[PDB]
Design a protein around this ligand. Sequence first.
Ligand SMILES: [Ca+2]
Length: 354
Amino acid sequence: TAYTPLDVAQAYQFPEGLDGQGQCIAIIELGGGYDEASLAQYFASLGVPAPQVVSVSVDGASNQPTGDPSGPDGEVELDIEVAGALAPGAKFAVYFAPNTDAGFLDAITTAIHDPTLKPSVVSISWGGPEDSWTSAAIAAMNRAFLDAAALGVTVLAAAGNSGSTDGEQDGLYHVDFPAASPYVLACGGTRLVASGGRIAQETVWNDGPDGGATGGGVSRIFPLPAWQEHANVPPSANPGASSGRGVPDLAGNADPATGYEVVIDGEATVIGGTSAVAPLFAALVARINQKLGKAVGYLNPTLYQLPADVFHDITEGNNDIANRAQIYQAGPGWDPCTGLGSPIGVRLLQALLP
Ligand SMILES: [Ca+2]
């Protein structure tokens, strides 16, 4: 199975008649590049306008396609194609920076404060284990996300593509950063079976140690935020582990088995990962912003107080690819695999109306 981003948009009942006009979405990139022409042929294929796309150099980096679909280029054009196909009225701003703690931070700080392009949304599909960041990088990134909240900018981050261990091989469970920041909308991954615009099945993305799985779990760095106190977040599964920020907040189709029809470095292919879900929801927020005539900005506190039927609950599966422990497991309501679940577009919009 495969979908266009349009197909996934329909299954999650994105509100129609909104193309993100008047919004600018920033996408953070730490490598590779796009060709603003291959993007144009791709969008044309979907029958949707090619949106405007501008690149921004950060810390000496720039838009440099490496030619390898398996490399950074894959993330870059996945991010622009999925969000661009769903919010084609919006302006895209692609900030390139070196793949390190400091250029990642500098990229994020730049997009957020950018007085020229002024994005109202920031989609992020890069990260690493929260315990692998420097302390000063941690704090700086959180100050930046704090700034985003003050400026009414929604920051979305992919929760990770390597299950509850997050690519770590030390035998412990770990959460990815920046998805672990409380100030980011952490995006989890599911397997979606949909048709006729109805969700037939939706479960945790888990394709074992070889096919990847959605990240998710409990932070051992950030404490359980005030607004997550009623979402029955467990302690981290690691021995001795306290209460922390539960990851993620929402989730969407991520399973390459049921992935995204994309065009990467001129080749037609089907991709997955939570890498796709932040751009997907970045387009949804932009449609909502256009509808409300105002930027919704930091959403985390509102989402966990909204009625449950705003979301499609995932209840089945786990994101454990390290062992047979099923840590963590999906369940009723919030869980450390899919958070609140997949958002239902028209209902989210409705719930935020004045
Ligand atoms: Ca659930």
